[PDB]
């Protein structure tokens, strides 16, 4: 288990997905045209996880770019690292999806889905040992939400034994393109509960607040939100992209993070938050990454309990001090970690720091407080759905009101399931 196949779908999916390949190509010493110009052998030791090797010693990302309109994928190709992607993997339709799940999942995207799967099969074929798939998308629009979940369901049929992980950006009125986002997100959440092994709940509410309150940016762009996202995307892929005596793949990590199959929605976090000179001490990283203010999903971890936690510290620091600090927060806040999963906080350290920061820490929390996120989208859904508002956009593409009623019920069940383990 070494190779991962990456898929990015929709405007959002392709935006944050482009930033992921920008950050990690820098970390691995791969330039905009694909050639290696690093110094450490650690940068090439597990480069096969995310890159294929080409003639002339060129490195090409194992990345498939999906969208139902050309716009954003033309911006990817024009952008800084766009030349590195394999041209055959740019798979795109023409008519768009108008922020419509139905268009993505049932009509427009159905016409394009099979040619995306042909490129997946092409990449999966020449993979010594495929460990699984990772996907970047929003749940608020049409393509990434509707088609992205359709792809996830098709990929599971053809590859039922492989791990499916997602970075799924959650919509919020604070950063809102259309009023129908709650509808699209609710329909998508039901898909992820069934068909993904882990889903990283990037909440645009949370990214906005971190940009506004804790970074003092008055008018935050999508780039300021995406800056925070890419820092986390790098962090969660660190232990696969480098050593350091850690013998873990996506499945091994999934096995240790997911105690119940439906409850695989994580609360990501990063320290320090940036947009510095003084490097943080190990105690600061530990307090910040556990702090609610640094959470990428707008939930209060004090309102739930941690099922499992994973933390990956980057930089040259004392592993003794890391152990001490990680043990300090658990033993001084032990009510918020479930007693019925012993030793549920696990940690790793990587010597190579990310670009700019001398030492950082990425937080992966499977907390029952994520019900707050799903309750918020459930409230927005019902506000509109009780008056069948904006439904004509979906019934026009063939959908029934029943499918909405099902999806409403499936997410409220997930909320109830999270509540069960919060009181146990």
């Amino acid at each position: 288990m070494r190779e991962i196949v990456h898929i990015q779908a929709g405007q959002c999916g392709n935006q944050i997905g482009a930033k992921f390949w920008e950050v990690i190509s820098d970390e691995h010493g791969i330039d905009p045209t694909g050639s290696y110009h690093g110094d450490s052998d650690l940068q090439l030791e597990r480069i096969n996880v995310y890159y294929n090797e080409a003639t002339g010693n060129k490195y090409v990302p194992r990345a498939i770019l999906v969208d139902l309109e050309p716009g954003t994928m033309d911006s990817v190709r024009s952008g800084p690292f766009g030349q590195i992607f394999r041209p055959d993997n740019f798979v795109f339709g023409q008519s768009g999806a108008g922020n419509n799940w139905a268009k993505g999942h049932y009509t427009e995207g159905a016409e394009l889905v099979d040619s995306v799967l042909d490129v997946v099969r092409k990449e999966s074929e020449s993979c010594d040992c495929l460990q699984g798939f990772q996907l970047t998308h929003s749940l608020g629009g049409g393509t990434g939400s509707g088609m992205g979940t359709l792809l996830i369901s098709k990929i599971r049929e053809e590859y039922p034994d492989r791990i499916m992980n997602t970075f799924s950006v959650m919509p919020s009125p604070k950063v809102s393109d259309t009023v129908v986002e709650p509808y699209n997100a609710t329909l998508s959440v039901h898909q992820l509960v069934e068909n993904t092994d882990e889903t990283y709940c990037i909440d645009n509410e949370a990214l906005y607040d971190i940009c506004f309150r804790t970074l003092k940016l008055t008018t935050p762009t999508y780039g300021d939100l995406n800056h925070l996202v890419s820092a986390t995307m790098s962090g969660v892929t660190t232990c696969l992209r480098f050593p350091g005596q850690l013998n873990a793949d996506l499945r091994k990590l999934a096995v240790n993070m997911v105690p119940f199959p439906r409850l695989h929605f994580f609360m990501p976090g990063f320290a320090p938050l940036t947009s510095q000179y003084r490097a943080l001490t190990v105690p600061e990283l530990t307090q910040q990454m556990f702090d609610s203010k640094n959470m990428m999903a707008a939930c209060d971890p004090r309102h739930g309990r941690y099922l499992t936690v994973a933390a990956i510290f980057r930089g040259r620091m004392s592993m003794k001090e890391v152990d001490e600090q990680m043990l300090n927060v658990q033993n001084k806040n032990s009510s918020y970690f479930v007693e019925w999963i012993p030793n549920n906080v696990k940690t790793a350290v990587c010597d190579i720091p990310p670009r700019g920061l001398k030492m950082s820490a990425t937080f992966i929390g499977n907390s029952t407080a994520i019900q707050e996120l799903f309750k918020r989208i459930s409230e927005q859904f019902t506000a509109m759905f009780r008056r069948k508002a904006f439904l004509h956009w979906y019934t026009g593409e063939g959908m029934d009101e029943m499918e909405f009623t099902e999806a409403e019920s499936n997410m409220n069940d997930l909320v109830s399931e999270y509540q069960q383990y919060q009181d146990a």
Partner: protein, 57 residues
């Protein structure tokens, strides 16, 4: 179902339109038929006027 309903809408728009345009042609022709029939009734009256002058001499 999306195709079925999109086709139904095209079908019934076409049938609703053809029914109105044929119903309109019936109504217009019948309105003009009645106008001429009233005018042709005046020619039959004017023929009786001209006969009752010659049949009174």
């Amino acid at each position: 179902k999306a195709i079925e309903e999109n086709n139904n809408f095209i079908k019934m728009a076409k049938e609703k339109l053809a029914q109105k345009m044929e119903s309109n042609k019936e109504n217009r022709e019948a309105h003009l038929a009645a106008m001429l029939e009233r005018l042709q009734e005046k020619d039959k009256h004017a023929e009786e006027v001209r006969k009752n002058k010659e049949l009174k001499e």
